[PDB]
Design a protein around this ligand. Structure first.
Ligand SMILES: CC[C@H]1OC(=O)[C@H](C)[C@@H](OC(=O)N2CCC[C@@H]2c2cccnc2)[C@H](C)[C@@H](O[C@@H]2O[C@H](C)C[C@H](N(C)C)[C@H]2O)[C@](C)(OC)C[C@@H](C)C(=O)[C@H](C)[C@H]2NC(=O)O[C@@]21C
Ligand SMILES: [Mg+2]
Ligand SMILES: [Mg+2]
Ligand SMILES: [Mg+2]
Ligand SMILES: [Mg+2]
Ligand SMILES: [Mg+2]
Ligand SMILES: [Mg+2]
Ligand SMILES: [Mg+2]
Ligand SMILES: [Mg+2]
Ligand SMILES: [Mg+2]
Lengths: 117, 110, 58
RNA sequence: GAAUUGGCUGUAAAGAUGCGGCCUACCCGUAGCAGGACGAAAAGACCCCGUGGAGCUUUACUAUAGUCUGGCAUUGGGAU
RNA sequence: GCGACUGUUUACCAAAAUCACAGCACUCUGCCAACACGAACAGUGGACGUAUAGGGUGUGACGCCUGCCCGGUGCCGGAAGGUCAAGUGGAGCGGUGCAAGCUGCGAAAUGAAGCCCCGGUGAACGGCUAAGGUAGCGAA
RNA sequence: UGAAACAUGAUUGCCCGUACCGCAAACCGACACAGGUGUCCGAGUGUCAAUGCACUAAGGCGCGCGAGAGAACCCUCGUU
RNA sequence: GUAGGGGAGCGUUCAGUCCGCGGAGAAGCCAUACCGGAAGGAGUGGUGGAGCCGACUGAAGUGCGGAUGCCGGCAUGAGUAACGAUAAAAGAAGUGAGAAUCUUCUUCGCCGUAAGGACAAGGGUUCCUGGGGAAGGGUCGUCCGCCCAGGGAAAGUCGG
RNA sequence: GGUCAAGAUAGUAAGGGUCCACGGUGGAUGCCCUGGCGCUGGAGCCGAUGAAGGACGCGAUUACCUGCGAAAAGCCCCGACGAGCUGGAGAUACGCUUUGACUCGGGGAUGUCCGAAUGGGGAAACCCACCUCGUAAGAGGUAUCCGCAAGGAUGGGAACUCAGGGAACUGAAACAUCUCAGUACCUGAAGGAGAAGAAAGAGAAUUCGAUUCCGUUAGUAGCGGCGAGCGAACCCGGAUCAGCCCAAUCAAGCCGAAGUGGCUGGAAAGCUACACCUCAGAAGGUGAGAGUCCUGUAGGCGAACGAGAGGUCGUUGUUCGUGAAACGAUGACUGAAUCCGCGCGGACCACCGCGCAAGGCUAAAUACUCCCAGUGACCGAUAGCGCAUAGUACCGUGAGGGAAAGGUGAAAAGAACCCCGGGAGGGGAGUGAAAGAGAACCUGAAACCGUGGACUUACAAGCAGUCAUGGCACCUUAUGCGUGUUAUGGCGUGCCUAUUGAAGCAUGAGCCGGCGACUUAGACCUGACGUGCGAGCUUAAGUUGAAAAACGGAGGCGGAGCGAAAGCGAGUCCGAAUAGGGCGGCAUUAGUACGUCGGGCUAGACUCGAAACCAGGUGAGCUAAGCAUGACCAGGUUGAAA
């Protein structure tokens, strides 16, 4: 018996061509280019998962030394204080305190200054 | 393309017979057979009636309105009736005419 | 061969952008002071054949 | 191939619109000009390669049409 | 300069100093000619011609001219001899059978054109070891 | 013994071709193509002659996109 | 983790078997934010209008982005180059749904050893009349060598 | 509130972008069959009484096809059928038919012109004759080769058969013997088959008993630049089965059993309730799915009158390549015996054994498939034949080459009438279940072209994404969940190929759809898995039954090795007996058939691509020339010999 492609390819093709959403020009309309775009998208996808994790910590650190410097300190110094006050092991959350709770952030600056000098 | 060979260019009626229409619309309705087309498998009975339009400009006056005429059928009418309904056929012999073979079933009249 | 030739197909975008000036400007139609069918400024009214008096037949 | 298709200096497979850094630049056309897009066109014609091909040559090899030559047929009789 | 001349050529990048040419030469061909086409003792061209003719090859009107080398190669010629095929000729060696027989191979001498060998030949291939350029020309 | 030849009467008169295009928009060129195609006729005036050249009879035709404009440049020309 | 070797599977057509579904709507197509570790699979809705899913087993013309791949459709260049000899053309009148282009009149201009006329070859009805107006006509046609129907071609002496 | 200043920020969209809605284009996909392919079986020649294949005709109307043949879509006779018919034809008019039309089965009768073509010519289908009979019309004859004459032959056949002649590419990783291969091709002869055939044989048993075919022997024996590679036969099993003569039942066709009501539906054949038939539940049709509605099926009947010698030289065949080369075969030369005779047995001799050449026929088993029937883990419109029909259109001077194209509806009920328009085209009305079927008629993907809406974009540097956050919008697997879109930030060198090294300014590619590449074969080899028997395992060809498998033991593999071989044998080989090779015991375990998979070999061997080589044919309508016969060269100048 004969077993022509019929239905299999078009379905295979529509799947790809639907991942292609706000894809500019041919990248959303023609299969070969839509599919091709996705290979490169795969690189970006797998990489950006572990990248966001560097991206955020960066943002986190930036907010910390901003507030640390508001109370005559800095990230390097502040963190060492909290480290030297072993009791203090915030690390995660610490950026939100600086940004939302200034009263609370000050307390932790004052504790960090002790454990150091 | 094929056409009415599925039978044998063979009917079960004559251009005179009274027949009942089994199947479809016009079910049970009876009438005389006025046209029998064996190869085509067509029956013109006083049954199925149609309203045919006339595309007639030059053709004998432009007054080509609507016409009352009956439209042909197949084997969607069971041939020959006497006990008030449709039947098969089985008993042949001769009447006064030997050469002729009649038809009949659970009864004996056609 | 056919010496200077296009390098890449021009996209549906790029092709369309070039046509942003191809739109016809509708005639400034005036209404005839007589026959009351519309006409072109500085021309004889098509309908009556007037241009103060009647110049053209019908 | 698809294009949302700038300049300088770099770097990169060693001649970058698509990488880095700096610079410049509102969106879109029309008429034009040929520097670039290693622009188009013909699966380099040079060059090398393939135990690839064909045309030509000769005292390359092997055969061969032709042709020269001994024998046997067709093919006989007499003299030395 | 080149080619004497009119002429001919690369349909579609070469028109020429290319080819052809009149003229000159070497040469082959005696007529069922040489030579050519062809399955072919067919047939035909050569030619319904006949050496003042026909084939081939070269040079290329006309003028004055065309030298030296015959070793190599080719062509024509001679033959004292050497070399050479089938065949004719069969001396010998060998197989087998008890035997006549039947058999396997086989020398010498004889056996053709060819080739080596000798002479010739240049408007033969050639050269300037077989000789080393006669006129004329020469930075073409 | 009714020849050939002449003369005048009658009778007889087979088959294929004939339209049209035919230096072309009807043929060959894939097209209604600036090429190609054998023969014949081919008037007048002027100019030694002529089938040359200019104009023109008869006859045929304005070439199946058109209209503005009056740039660069490109083609074919005139003058310098 | 490339060549490569090994393992487990998804999907397509056909087949045998079983369970079924379907004109109160099958396949196919279309949309989707659901499921599975992946190939993939389901729900709902929309179209369609007569056939078909699931499970096991069997067999293959069984899975495509590439081959200057093949067939077909459609884009780009782009409303761009061109519209085929630089022998012109003008107005009037007519016709018609419609006219630069068709008819007619008056002019103009180009050929005139031809761009006139008569054969031959070759072509085949292109001829004439009356109609037409899709497509052909490089534009437009009311017109045509295009389309439809009717007609036309005449030999003892001309060619054979 | 107002003026001035300083800041910041919104909205505009010529046009674009993403998404959504609706369309157009196009013809994928699904469904279908009107058409093909393969295998199985049947059947198998036509023609001078004029074929195969054609030209021109024949219609009331006729372009194409069909059928026919001036007696022309038909004429006569016989049979069957029993009411319709007037070809496809979707088309009106005229008619024909129970004094039996039509159609089907079987005969006849007419059969123009061409074609073997056949009176002669010829550029097929056209010219031109003569002779006999005849009232003109019209009829018959006139070709050569066989034979007295009757009567036979010319020509055509897809493949198959034998014969004459006979390549090269290719393998040999070059090439030359060799291979491809006596293949392809040409030519001849013939038939439904042919060929071959009745032992001067095979051959080693003093077996056999015509030929062909199949299995097997067996990749054995052997051939071989002993290379690539080529490759028998006897025995045995099987299909079929003969030896004779001379010379001295199936087509036409008829009969054929049994369901009714309600329901859903446009429509019942489906659903439901009770019912029957079955020697028939195979199949097609009927508005949807059918035992009981039609055609049929099982079963039965059935036709007037219809088929079933030796030699030398040269070479060669088969495993046969000059080998030790026998034997056949024959171009050249020679040339015997006649049964106490001849030929053979692989140089050759003798012995032993097999057989009678120099005359002819001979069925069956075998092969092929133009055609016919049946069937299918064959195709279903880019598939399948090239064709759902066409060897057409188109291309070519010719030989030759060569397409694509399917689908209204159940039924034409094919849309009267109205409206815009010259028309085309549409909108209605009506028909229909649906016109979401309207004749560019099933579905109607995608590329591609549009209209409308949402969010957006005119200081911007860009492999076009990706991650994060904010803004706007929306709520049918879908309200914490997202979905769409959008601003800004970060990050970010298309894909494939080829490659030490690809974004590469290296290759390929306009886009989409479909088509498109590791297969198949063999009683082949070797391995993994698996099963069945197991020291044993297994069938091949065939035969008989076939809604199906059984039989068939010929043969193949284990079962003993070692050697060059004789041969010997758990031993055997070198050798003269002692060292060793290979084998056995091994301490010792097993195979064989079929299957699926890995791999190998042989074939086109994963697909696509040469330049070229060979065979037979087509072309000098172009162009190079030759021959025959015609045609042509205005006008002017110069001024040779005589
Ligand atoms: C006149 C049109 C005619 O072109 C020519 O004839 C010119 C003159 C010719 O130039 C030439 O052949 N030549 C020969 C040398 C002078 C001239 C030349 C070359 C380059 C540029 N310009 C001129 C080409 C440019 C030449 O290419 C050149 O080929 C060279 C082999 C290599 C060059 N490369 C490096 C760029 C390439 O361009 C080729 C080979 O053609 C013939 C090109 C191929 C594609 C071709 O056949 C075309 C289809 C060709 N045939 C046709 O009908 O139309 C064309 C286009
Ligand atoms: Mg330019
Ligand atoms: Mg000269
Ligand atoms: Mg000259
Ligand atoms: Mg102009
Ligand atoms: Mg102006
Ligand atoms: Mg592709
Ligand atoms: Mg289809
Ligand atoms: Mg056919
Ligand atoms: Mg390369």
């Amino acid at each position: 018996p004969r077993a022509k492609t019929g239905i299999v390819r078009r379905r295979r093709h529509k799947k790809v061509l639907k991942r292609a959403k706000g894809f500019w020009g041919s990248r959303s309309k023609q299969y070969r280019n839509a599919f091709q775009t996705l290979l490169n998208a795969a690189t970006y996808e797998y990489r950006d998962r572990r990248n966001k994790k560097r991206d955020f910590r960066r943002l986190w650190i930036q907010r910390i030394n901003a507030g640390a410097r508001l109370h005559g300190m800095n990230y390097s110094t502040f963190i060492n204080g909290l480290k030297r006050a072993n009791i203090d092991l915030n690390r995660k959350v610490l950026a939100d305190i600086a940004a939302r709770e200034p009263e609370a952030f000050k307390a932790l600056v004052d504790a960090s200054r002790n454990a150091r000098q | 393309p094929s056409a009415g060979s599925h039978h044998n260019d063979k009917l079960h009626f004559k251009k005179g017979d009274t027949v009942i229409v089994l199947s479809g619309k016009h079910k049970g309705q009876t009438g005389k057979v006025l046209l029998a087309l064996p190869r085509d498998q067509k029956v013109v009975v006083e049954g199925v009636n149609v309203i045919t339009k006339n595309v007639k400009p030059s053709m004998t006056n432009p007054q080509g309105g609507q016409e009352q005429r009956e439209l042909a059928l197949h084997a969607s009418k069971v041939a020959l009736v006497d006990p008030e309904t449709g039947k098969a056929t089985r008993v042949r012999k001769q009447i006064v005419d030997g050469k002729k073979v009649r038809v009949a079933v659970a009864s004996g009249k056609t | 061969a056919k010496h200077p030739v296009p390098k890449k197909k021009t996209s549906k975008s790029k092709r369309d952008m070039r046509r942003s000036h191809h739109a016809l400007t509708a005639p400034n139609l005036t209404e005839c002071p007589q026959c009351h069918g519309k006409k072109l400024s500085h021309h004889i009214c098509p309908n009556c054949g007037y241009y103060d008096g009647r110049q053209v037949l019908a």
